[PDB]
Design a protein around this nucleic acid. Sequence first.
RNA 1: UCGGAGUACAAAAAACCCUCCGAGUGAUUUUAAUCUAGACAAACCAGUCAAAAUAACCAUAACAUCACUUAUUGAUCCAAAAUUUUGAUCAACGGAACAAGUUACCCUAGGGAUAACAGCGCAAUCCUGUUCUAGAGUUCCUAUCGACAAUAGGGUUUACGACCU
RNA 2: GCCUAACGAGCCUGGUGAUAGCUGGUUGUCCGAGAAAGAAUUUUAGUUCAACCUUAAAAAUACCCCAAAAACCCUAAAUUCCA
Lengths: 100, 95, 110, 52, 19, 354
Amino acid sequence: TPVKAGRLIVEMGGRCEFKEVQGFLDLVAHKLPFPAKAVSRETLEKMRKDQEERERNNQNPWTFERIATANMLGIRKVLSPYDLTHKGRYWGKFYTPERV
Amino acid sequence: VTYFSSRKGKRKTVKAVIYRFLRLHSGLWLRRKAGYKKKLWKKTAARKRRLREFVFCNKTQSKLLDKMTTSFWKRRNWYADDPYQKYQDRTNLKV
Amino acid sequence: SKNLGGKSPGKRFGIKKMEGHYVHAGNILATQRHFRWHPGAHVGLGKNKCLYALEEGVVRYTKEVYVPNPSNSEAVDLVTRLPQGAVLYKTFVHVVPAKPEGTFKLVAML
Amino acid sequence: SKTILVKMMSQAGTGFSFNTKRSRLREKLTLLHYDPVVKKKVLFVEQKKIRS
Amino acid sequence: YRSKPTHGIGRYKHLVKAQ
Amino acid sequence: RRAAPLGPMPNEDIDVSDLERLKKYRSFDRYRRRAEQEARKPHWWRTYREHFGEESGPKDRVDIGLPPPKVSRTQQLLERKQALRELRANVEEERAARLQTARIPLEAVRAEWERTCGPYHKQRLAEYCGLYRDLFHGATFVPRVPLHVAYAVGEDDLMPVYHGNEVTPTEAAQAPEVTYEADEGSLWTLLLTNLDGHLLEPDAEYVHWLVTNIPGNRVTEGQETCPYLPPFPARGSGFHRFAFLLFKQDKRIDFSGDTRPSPCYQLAQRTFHTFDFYKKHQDAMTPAGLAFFQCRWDDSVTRVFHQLLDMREPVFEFVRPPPYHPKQKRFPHRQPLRYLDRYRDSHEPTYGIY
RNA sequence: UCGGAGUACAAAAAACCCUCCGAGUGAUUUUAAUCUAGACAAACCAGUCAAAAUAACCAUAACAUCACUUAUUGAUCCAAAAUUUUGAUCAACGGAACAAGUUACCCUAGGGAUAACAGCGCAAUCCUGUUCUAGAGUUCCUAUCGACAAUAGGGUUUACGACCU
RNA sequence: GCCUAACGAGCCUGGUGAUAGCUGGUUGUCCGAGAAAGAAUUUUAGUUCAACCUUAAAAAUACCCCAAAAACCCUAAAUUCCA
Ligand SMILES: Nc1nc2c(ncn2[C@@H]2O[C@H](COP(=O)(O)O)[C@@H](O)[C@H]2O)c(=O)[nH]1
Ligand SMILES: [Mg+2]
Ligand SMILES: [Mg+2]
Ligand SMILES: [Mg+2]
Ligand SMILES: [Mg+2]
Ligand SMILES: [Mg+2]
Ligand SMILES: [Mg+2]
Ligand SMILES: [Mg+2]
Ligand SMILES: [Mg+2]
Ligand SMILES: [Mg+2]
Ligand SMILES: [Mg+2]
Ligand SMILES: [Mg+2]
Ligand SMILES: [Mg+2]
Ligand SMILES: [Mg+2]
Ligand SMILES: [Mg+2]
Ligand SMILES: [Mg+2]
Ligand SMILES: [Mg+2]
Ligand SMILES: [Mg+2]
Ligand SMILES: [Mg+2]
Ligand SMILES: [Mg+2]
Ligand SMILES: [Mg+2]
Ligand SMILES: [Mg+2]
Ligand SMILES: [Mg+2]
Ligand SMILES: [Mg+2]
Ligand SMILES: [Mg+2]
Ligand SMILES: [Mg+2]
Ligand SMILES: [Mg+2]
Ligand SMILES: [Mg+2]
Ligand SMILES: [Mg+2]
Ligand SMILES: [Mg+2]
Ligand SMILES: [Mg+2]
Ligand SMILES: [Mg+2]
């Protein structure tokens, strides 16, 4: 089965608190082929709001988006078309969340 | 092609050309279409017509056929009753 | 091997003249495997489904309502099963005729 | 089943011929064709068998 | 044509279900 | 790369969800109708109507008319309802219907039509034949007063001029009988114009017969400005159109400017612009009646040019443009021999130095 | 050799000992003419459409149809026919008119354009470690092991590639 | 196996300047422009056609190109065509 980054593999509900489920779910997560985490609704929305807040905080004027879309420095030559969507956050099958 | 013959030291003509083409004096060569007698029952009326035509050769072929043919075949001929005398000169050609 | 003979050249189906071009009568406007473009005004249909200009003029493309010939079973069935507000649309090619049909000249004054 | 290529001749007395694929196990073929010399639609009957 | 505003104007099959 | 539709897409309205509960036209014909209605609407995408000349499309019409007759809606409605009650009532009529034997008294229908919606039909015929385009240039009028024109072909023979009809110049050799209905405080002007067939001037026309200050229905009593001149198309050109115009005027108008000599066989003297002529007298004259006919050259016309106008007779052809041939090539490739004949000048051998 | 779909996402074109379906014809009668503007396609050969005009027929009467319709095919020469045509699993399908094995008894011309040895690349296979513990260990995960899996390295093996000779 | 130091068929002369799509070689100076492969082929170690290119010569538009325009279920970067 193909799995793209950002997709939920397994969904656990219950009368549980997040912490127990987290404890054993992180094992499974660790034994998956891709890098993966254990998350709750709270944790997920937390990291998404953090993700966008990081990108409206950004001090340097120069973002991958701004440069790629406008083809500055003729940079499109080295980029893939898909990059216009991926915005330097995804490279191959790898996803680095730190990338704004 | 023989460029220098043995006996005469002249340049021979390739007769196989003289049998299937016709040289107008303008330099245009004329030929029959290929397979025009072949398997007629199997072909469209339209296609049959397209085959029955007499057609002209492109430049490359024309130069080739010229090289394969001596000077005699390029002379201006006046034949009595000739169908093709009408077609020997070129008119209104702006080039 | 298992797989064989996938090899055949492209048929060069496509559209030969484009909107706004000038054409002379008999020019092939487009050629196609299935009807993609339908013939419009002053455009003849070939038996291979290709479109050619019947008049000298300018090529125009257009979307229009499609009302199939009642002798054609399939198309009538397709039309008949449509919801009551619906109307089939298709894409057409026309030639807007350029030259006047002919002129009146003075032959002789008797 | 095989078909057959037969030569068909005008009854218009004009020598004129056209060849036709016809079913082998069928009857001797007879048609109404166009004869160019008489410029008419006339009756053609199969004279000969050309190809098999 | 995909690029144009008029794209899919001739689209029908979703109106009639024959399968 | 998707673009965004500009305005509504055609079928976007109906619900795809639950197709089975939607009503369909199982009729081919219903579909055909709906389609022809859809083809008459002003869409936002390139369409046939757009390129093929709806002829100015939307046009605000300057109208120089006679004011439409004022009639009570409700009263008329009542009367008609009644008449149809009476007509439906009879058993005789129903017998006539089931057994497929009935006839309509065409003369009466023609009278009613002349009286009622006739003016509009005559109008759109005039629009079709471009009367309005060549006369008043922008202007449409409804022919409120019916105009009856006829010619005498013999003692017992009468050739009517309806709108758009064909008449032979032989028939038209004499001035026609003219009839319309008005009481007299009235003053009218009648005009006969040849719309095309002016030889020198594409934008101008010929006055044939112009009559003025016409009391009531009395035709001959009016002073004739331009005496009747028989129709004279030219041999080559087909179907010139002649126009009978009828203006209702208030004041008596006198024009020495428009008056022509009594014989007046000069063509430069009859040269006319209906537009200008109307501009002049615009205040008093309001165009009312219209009837016109199509006319092609016939034998009798020859007599005119020689005998009256003291001219030679011009004859025309219809000349089609020469066929288009591509630039000639030095080595036409794969082209039939007869190719060389397309660029041939004339069929005749030419032996240059020989 | 020929065709349809993908590869080749929207004009065209576009490869693989690439992925998949087919063709080497039936059946039928509407037996489907002559001539010619202009074009498509295209190295060439071959392929395709087609107005007007003639002639056929209702007395202003020219698209053979169906099977996914697309493919159902073959040049010159030469043979048979006599008036106008017909003939190739020429399927190595642009086609030599007609010809098989074997050589370690071999020869010559070349090739690192191409194999066997070795190197190099790579790491499927191989070898090391760590990560994760269900389980074995009487009880007890990690004394000794450790399935399902994870991360990273090594460059012994068999291959793979054909880059130096 | 042997047949005058090399015999899967001797040696010598002639045919002979055999024929090699294969390897090697191919001799003054300076200047102008300048090329990576579509098609057939007992063809893929080669040819012959195209496309490019060179040298002359005739011309007139040539690239660049905004709308408008190019399909039917879903479909991107973008193409085509043009003032
Ligand atoms: N089938 C056929 N064979 C031909 C043709 N032209 C020449 N031939 C050859 O002519 C020869 C006739 O003798 P056969 O071998 O048939 O008895 C054969 O070698 C054949 O290949 C042709 O056009 N068709
Ligand atoms: Mg393919
Ligand atoms: Mg190919
Ligand atoms: Mg082309
Ligand atoms: Mg015709
Ligand atoms: Mg071969
Ligand atoms: Mg081959
Ligand atoms: Mg080929
Ligand atoms: Mg040979
Ligand atoms: Mg041994
Ligand atoms: Mg050797
Ligand atoms: Mg190598
Ligand atoms: Mg190589
Ligand atoms: Mg060795
Ligand atoms: Mg080894
Ligand atoms: Mg070694
Ligand atoms: Mg090795
Ligand atoms: Mg080494
Ligand atoms: Mg490694
Ligand atoms: Mg245990
Ligand atoms: Mg992991
Ligand atoms: Mg080593
Ligand atoms: Mg490997
Ligand atoms: Mg390589
Ligand atoms: Mg010896
Ligand atoms: Mg040599
Ligand atoms: Mg070679
Ligand atoms: Mg270079
Ligand atoms: Mg061969
Ligand atoms: Mg070359
Ligand atoms: Mg544009
Ligand atoms: Mg331009």
